[PDB]
Design a protein around this ligand. Structure first.
Ligand SMILES: O[C@@H]1[C@@H](O)[C@H](O[C@@H]2CO[C@@H](O)[C@H](O)[C@H]2O)OC[C@H]1O
Ligand code: XYP
Ligand code: ZN
Ligand code: ZN
Length: 197
C-alpha cells in the first residue's frame, strides 16, 4: 500500500476528513480490523476473523460524482468492494458492488432490472434492514444494490447512472449523506489498499 506513508492505525469506529477526503471506518468490534489513512485519497484496511465492518474514503456529502479508484483488494472470505453511501429522509443505504468474494450480498431479493454503465452490467435489487445500525443509530431502512456481473478492482463508477436506474425501478433516494469507495467484510480475513482519485 502506502508503505511508510500509512497514518496511525485505527481499530474502532470513527469518521473524519484526511487529505481533503471524508473517511468512514465502522466496525462492530469483532476479530481484529485495522484501518489507516494514506496520502490523498488512499486508505488501507487489514482484517482477521472480523465481525461486520465497512471502511473507506470519499465525500460527505456525496454529490453523484463520477468516481475513479485504483488499488488492490485481497480478501480471504466474505468481502465486498463497492461505491457505498447513505441518503436521509428517507434513510437509504446503497451499494454499487464492484467485486464480492464468497457471498453475493444481493442474496434475499427480487431483481428489479439491470443498468449498463462503465463497460459493465449491474443487476438492481432492493432489500430492507430492520432494527439495524445506521448513520442515524438503530433504524429500519431500504437497502439498494447495483451488483456488477463481471467483478473488477478499479475503473470508473458513474454514480448518477446507478441513481437514475434505481429511480427508474421505483426506488426513492433522499438527501445524500456520505459516499465512499468502501471495503466491507464479515467473518473473514484479508487486506485492501484503495486510492480514490
Ligand atoms: O456512532 C455512529 C456510527 O456508529 C454510525 O456508523 C454507521 C453504522 O451503520 C453502518 O452501516 C454504517 O456504515 C456506519 O456509517 O454513524 C452514526 C454515528 O453516530
Ligand atoms: O447496518 C449497516 C449494514 O447493512 C451495512 O452494510 O454495514 C454497515 C451498517
Ligand atoms: Zn468475485
Ligand atoms: Zn472481467
Amino acid at each position: 500500500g502506502a508503505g511508510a506513508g500509512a497514518g496511525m492505525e485505527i481499530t474502532s469506529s470513527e469518521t473524519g476528513t484526511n487529505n481533503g477526503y471524508y473517511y468512514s471506518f465502522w466496525t462492530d468490534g469483532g476479530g481484529q480490523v485495522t484501518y489507516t489513512n494514506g496520502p490523498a485519497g488512499q486508505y488501507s484496511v487489514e482484517w482477521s476473523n472480523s465481525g461486520n465492518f465497512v471502511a473507506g474514503k470519499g465525500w460527505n456529502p456525496g454529490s453523484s460524482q463520477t468516481i475513479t479508484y485504483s488499488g488492490e483488494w485481497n480478501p480471504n472470505g466474505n468481502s465486498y468492494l463497492s461505491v457505498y453511501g447513505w441518503t436521509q429522509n428517507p434513510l437509504v443505504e446503497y451499494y454499487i458492488v464492484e467485486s464480492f468474494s464468497t457471498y453475493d450480498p444481493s442474496t434475499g431479493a427480487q431483481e428489479l432490472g439491470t443498468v449498463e454503465t462503465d463497460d459493465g452490467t449491474y443487476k438492481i435489487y432492493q432489500t430492507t434492514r430492520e432494527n439495524a445500525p445506521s448513520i442515524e443509530g438503530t433504524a429500519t431502512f431500504n437497502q439498494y444494490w447495483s451488483v456488477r456481473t463481471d467483478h473488477r478492482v478499479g475503473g470508473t463508477v458513474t454514480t448518477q447512472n446507478h441513481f437514475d436506474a434505481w429511480k427508474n425501478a421505483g426506488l426513492e433516494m433522499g438527501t445524500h449523506n456520505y459516499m465512499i469507495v468502501a471495503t466491507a467484510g464479515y467473518q473473514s480475513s484479508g487486506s485492501a489498499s484503495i486510492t480514490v482519485q
